[PDB]
From Swiss-Prot, chains B, G:
Subcellular locations according to the entry: Mitochondrion; Mitochondrion inner membrane; Cell membrane
Name used for this protein in its record: ATP synthase F(1) complex subunit alpha, mitochondrial
Additional free-text comment from the UniProt record: The siderophore enterobactin (Ent) produced by enteric bacteria binds Fe(3+) and helps bacteria scavenge iron ions from the environment. As a consequence, the mammalian siderocalin LCN2 plays an important role in defense against bacterial infections by sequestering iron bound to microbial siderophores. LCN2 can also bind iron bound to endogenous or nutrient-derived iron chelators and plays an important role in cellular iron homeostasis.
PTMs per UniProt: Acetylated on lysine residues. BLOC1S1 is required for acetylation.
Portion held of the full protein: 427 to 553 of 553
Family label: Belongs to the ATPase alpha/beta chains family.
Biological process according to GO: proton motive force-driven ATP synthesis
N6-acetyllysine: modified positions: 1, 8, 72, 80, 105, 113, 115
Residues with PTM N6-succinyllysine: 1, 72, 80, 105, 113
Molecular function (Gene Ontology), one example: proton-transporting ATP synthase activity, rotational mechanism
Gene Ontology CC entries for this record: mitochondrial inner membrane; plasma membrane; proton-transporting ATP synthase complex
Tissue expression as described in the entry: Expressed in heart (at protein level).
Keyword Magnesium: yes
Keywords from the named record: Acetylation, ATP synthesis, ATP-binding, Cell membrane, CF(1), Glycoprotein, Hydrogen ion transport, Ion transport, Magnesium, Membrane, Metal-binding, Methylation, Mitochondrion, Mitochondrion inner membrane, Nucleotide-binding, Phosphoprotein, Transit peptide, Transport
From Swiss-Prot, chain D:
Keywords (A to Z) from UniProt: Coiled coil, Mitochondrion, Transit peptide
Region (Disordered): 1-23
Region (N-terminal inhibitory region): 1-27
UniProt family annotation: Belongs to the ATPase inhibitor family.
Oligomer and partners: Homodimer; represents the active form and is present at a pH value below 6.5. Homotetramer; represents the inactive form and is present at a pH value above 7.0.
Gene: ATP5IF1
Protein name as catalogued: ATPase inhibitor, mitochondrial
Domain comment (free text): Forms an alpha-helical dimer with monomers associated via an antiparallel alpha-helical coiled coil composed of residues 74-106, leaving each N-terminal inhibitory region (residues 26-52) accessible for interaction with an F1 catalytic domain. The inhibitory N-terminal region (residues 26-52) binds the alpha(ADP-bound)-beta(ADP-bound) (ATP5F1A-ATP5F1B) interface of F1-ATPase, and also contact the central gamma subunit (ATP5F1C).
Species: Sus scrofa
Function as written in the Swiss-Prot or TrEMBL entry: Endogenous F(1)F(o)-ATPase inhibitor limiting ATP depletion when the mitochondrial membrane potential falls below a threshold and the F(1)F(o)-ATP synthase starts hydrolyzing ATP to pump protons out of the mitochondrial matrix. Required to avoid the consumption of cellular ATP when the F(1)F(o)-ATP synthase enzyme acts as an ATP hydrolase. Indirectly acts as a regulator of heme synthesis in erythroid tissues: regulates heme synthesis by modulating the mitochondrial pH and redox potential, allowing FECH to efficiently catalyze the incorporation of iron into protoporphyrin IX to produce heme.
Cellular localisation: Mitochondrion
Main location (coarse class): mitochondrion
Listed GO biological process terms: erythrocyte differentiation; heme biosynthetic process; mitochondrial depolarization; negative regulation of endothelial cell proliferation; negative regulation of hydrolase activity; negative regulation of mitochondrial ATP synthesis coupled proton transport; positive regulation of mitochondrial outer membrane permeabilization involved in apoptotic signaling pathway; positive regulation of proteolysis involved in protein catabolic process
Keyword Protein biosynthesis: no
Record-annotated membrane-spanning stretches: none
Positions spanned in the full protein: 26 to 80 of 108
Length: 132, 127, 48, 55, 218, 117, 127, 114, 114
């Protein structure tokens, strides 16, 4: 109650000043739930789906890629994300194939930071399939 | 008179917007269309020396352009398409160019009969 | 701290890769909006 | 004037034939730009490997 | 003059007149596009700034390094746009040198570097050209902000100068600060906040550098 | 029908790119050279090489120039101009065609300018 | 002919590139060697009134600037440089100018002999 | 020889800055003032005060405007065109140079429009 | 002082309103429509009523275009445009004014639409 939820891509805007009681965000260092007066933090995101529960009967299943959640002192949040798409624009069939090919290059990485780049890529496709 | 009355109006709308062609990509899709028809109507107007045509062959080439049957063909190919299309309709559609020469007008029967002709040729053309 | 930490990376270098994978899992219809953003146009000029 | 066949109308290539301020500003901009392209096309023309073996 | 002299000068100002009419309708259809694409990029630009106003943050007494980010285009014919931001960058550098701070500046346009090539050719960090031909996007705000980190220059305060417009007629050159350092962002107004460490605030304060550039570029 | 169809479409191909070069100079006077697109930065650079390739060192003008007298045959004049139009010499600067004979000396003069950097 | 032939060709490349009055690109190494040499060659060509110089004295002024011995001086002082350098040659080096006149041409013994005196002058003229 | 080497050098600097201003009037009229260089916003900003300093209130035209007729000596119209061509008076507007006598009344007019 | 004050202030306002539509037709063509004020939307609507009320079917063309040729006296034309300016007949659509005689036959043509 008496909240404000803002959800904006760089090119488009989903929510402006319209809050619905509960926001689920995948944090880099875990996960959290927003329930009308959460103790404010400054967190950053991991690849994972955002399921905003509208009042409105049902929920809203978005899927962010990397953004920033700023819940602040007054009861108002500002969730800004870079690639915030829904579910139906994605195809599951291409997401299955992209996993094991990046696992195949993981053994074939000679350097230490180039292999660390491969570990970033397999994590994002892992949250891709399990969200589907 | 029937086809060239719209061609005269179509070319006159092009000459208004000829000064936007040198730097134009951020314009409206109607203005991009008005440039697209004006270039392709111009290539129909070019003509070699000592080759005078007939009025029944002239009205067919204008009918191919003013209807909209050329806005997907590349602007450099409009000359090669025209010399191919004219030698077709002389030998294979001689009985249509005797019903515009003798009739004088273009009826509703000849409007449909010319309509599948330029759709048959445009379908398999590039070979 | 993670594997992209303590190996010498930045969070933009993290955020470039995980957002690039979402633009590869899109369909043929929404591939143009992945071509739309595609922000590789700024050149690099350092004097040395 | 120009909205009739009688009056004076301007053609293509009339800024250079006047020879004024804009006619001189155009000649020194086509030369100061295509002077640098005689640098990059001549510096990369020395990168023929067969000449270096002769060197 | 002679009749041959009058006619040739008369025809030359017909072509200059017809071309500036054609270049008015071209750059007005580029204006209506940039007005529609600003309103989604306004609230996303306002929201990323909105954390710092709900906190009393200021660079307190003295810090050793600095950055000025000069934002302009790679095009001319625009009146006094480039001259205003070149006037504001020279005012701030001459004022901060009274406090003994070392200043390094970076220009994201050609015509910023071309003006300042004489007086300040040794205070440049990097320069970014080919900006303004195609419309700016968020990927170009990430290319610039990535190379501002991995250069070797570890700075502690800074500010950005750009032209926030009020209307079709009147714009304004403006000033906005960049709290890039983690410890100046470690003050009394963050101890009220939650479990954020110096690793989480390291990742977060970097991402707001890419959100002030995309705000500035639009 | 007299000079053959190969000479004819080369002559009109030269005049069409020179006349289209004339209408482009009216834009560079207000805009500039660099603000043009990449597609008509090429038809200028093809036209400027056609202007300079037409100039030939005469024989009876040796005391003005000091250069030698060249005499290009007819079959070589067409084949020199097909290759600048088609784009087979986009890797040379403009100065490699000034006061040369056939197209063979246009690349020999191109390398001799390179080494003095 | 051995000293003005490479003076004419350095002025012809100056008039083509110096018509802007509005420069936006700094080509400091590219053309500013060419565009700031022709400024010095132009002010070398100014003259007073009722003062006709001799032919061998004229070579000793042009050769001082075409091989590039004036490229360090300020542009406001090139006319002051010459009416001091005109005195230093006509008094102490008369037999040098007697060789340029009587032979009619400059040779390789005279070329390096003329190279030293302009360098001793420039090392002593500046204050 | 006849008028001197100091009179002849200031009088030729005035005809140099007024000729370069005359070659830029074809561009300032089209593209405006903001398309020039930075050193060519100083030839314009100085020739527009030498032009107004060649105005003088005559003695027989007292009944036209009601201004006093002013006379200058020859040694003081050399000093007035040195302190403008050098850049001593680059903090005054152009209209302060309008219809005065010697150079001392130009600074006694710019204090009025303060 | 020739045609009187009744003819004057009617025919003066017609040419003034026909200029404002000539100046506002350029912002609408370049920028767009809805940005202009609500007081200007009536001047756009009224000036398309006036420039169609100037049309008139002639008696020499009765055979071709089929309409009836109308000969309007002077006191009807001044009475007509005195009411279009005041917003008195503004709620009627545009095609009631195309090719009519006096103002009386205008409202008799709004009934036949739909």
């Amino acid at each position: 109650g008496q909240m404000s939820f803002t959800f904006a891509s760089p090119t488009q805007v989903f929510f402006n000043g319209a809050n619905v009681r509960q926001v689920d965000v995948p944090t880099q260092t875990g996960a959290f739930g927003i329930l009308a007066s959460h103790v404010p933090t400054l967190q950053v995101l991991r690849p994972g789906l955002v399921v905003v529960h509208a009042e409105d009967g049902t929920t809203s299943k978005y899927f962010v890629s990397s953004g920033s959640v700023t819940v602040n002192a007054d009861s108002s949040v500002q969730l800004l994300a870079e690639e915030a798409v829904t579910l139906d624009m994605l195809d599951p069939g291409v997401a299955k194939a992209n996993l094991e090919k990046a696992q195949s290059e993981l053994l074939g990485a000679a350097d230490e930071a180039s292999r660390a780049e491969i570990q970033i890529r397999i994590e994002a496709n892992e949250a891709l399939v399990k969200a589907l | 008179k029937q086809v060239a009355g719209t061609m005269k109006l179509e070319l006159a709308q092009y000459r208004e917007v000829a000064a936007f062609a040198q730097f134009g990509s951020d314009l409206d899709a109607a203005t991009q269309q008005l440039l697209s028809r004006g270039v392709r109507l111009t290539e129909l107007l070019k003509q070699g020396q000592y080759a005078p045509m007939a009025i029944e062959e002239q009205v067919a080439v204008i009918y191919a352009g003013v209807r909209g049957y050329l806005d997907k063909l590349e602007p450099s190919k409009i000359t090669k398409f025209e010399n191919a299309f004219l030698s077709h309709v002389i030998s294979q559609h001689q009985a249509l160019l005797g019903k515009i020469r003798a009739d004088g007008k273009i009826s509703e029967e000849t409007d449909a009969k010319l309509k599948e002709i330029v759709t048959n040729f445009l379908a398999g053309f590039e070979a | 701290v993670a594997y992209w930490r303590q190996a010498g990376l930045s969070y933009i270098r993290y955020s470039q890769i995980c957002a690039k994978a979402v633009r590869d899992a899109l369909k043929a219809e929404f591939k143009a909006n992945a071509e739309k953003t595609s922000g590789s146009n700024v050149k690099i000029v350092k004097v040395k | 004037s120009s909205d009739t066949p009688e009056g004076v109308r301007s053609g293509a290539g009339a800024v250079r034939d006047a020879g004024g301020a804009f006619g001189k500003k155009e000649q020194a901009d086509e030369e100061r730009y295509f002077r640098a392209r005689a640098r990059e096309q001549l510096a990369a023309l020395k990168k023929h490997h067969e000449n270096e073996i002769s060197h | 003059a002679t009749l041959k002299d009058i006619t040739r000068r008369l025809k030359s100002i017909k072509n200059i007149q017809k071309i500036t009419k054609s270049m008015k309708m071209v750059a007005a259809a580029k204006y209506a596009r940039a007005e529609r694409d600003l309103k989604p990029a306004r609230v996303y630009g306002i929201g990323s700034l909105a954390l710092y106003e709900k906190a009393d943050i200021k660079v307190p007494e003295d810090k050793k390094k600095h950055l000025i980010i000069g934002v302009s285009s790679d095009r001319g014919l625009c009146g006094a746009i480039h001259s205003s931001v070149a006037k504001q960058i020279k005012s701030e550098v001459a004022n901060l040198t009274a406090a003994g701070k070392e200043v390094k500046i970076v220009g994201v346009g050609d015509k910023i570097r071309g003006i300042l090539h004489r007086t300040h050719s040794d205070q440049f960090l990097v320069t970014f050209k080919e900006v303004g031909r195609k419309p700016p996007t968020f990927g170009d705000a990430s290319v610039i902000a990535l190379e501002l980190l991995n250069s070797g220059y570890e700075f502690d305060e800074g500010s950005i100068i750009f032209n926030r417009f009020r209307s079709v007629i009147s714009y304004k050159t403006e000033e906005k600060p960049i709290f890039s350092l983690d410890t100046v962002a470690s003050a009394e107004s963050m101890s009220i906040y939650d479990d954020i460490d110096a690793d989480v605030l390291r990742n977060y304060q970097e991402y707001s550098l890419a959100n002030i550039i995309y705000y500035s570029l639009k | 029908n007299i000079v053959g169809s190969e000479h004819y479409d080369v002559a009109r191909g030269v005049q069409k790119i020179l006349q289209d070069y004339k209408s482009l100079q009216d834009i560079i006077a207000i805009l500039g050279m660099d603000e043009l697109s990449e597609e008509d930065k090429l038809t200028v650079s093809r036209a400027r090489k056609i202007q300079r390739f037409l100039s030939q060192p005469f024989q009876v003008a040796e005391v003005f120039t000091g250069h030698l007298g060249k005499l290009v045959p007819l079959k070589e004049t067409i084949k020199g101009f097909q290759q600048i139009l088609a784009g087979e010499y986009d890797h040379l600067p403009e100065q490699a065609f000034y006061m040369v004979g056939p197209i063979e000396e246009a690349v020999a003069k191109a390398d001799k300018l390179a080494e003095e950097h």
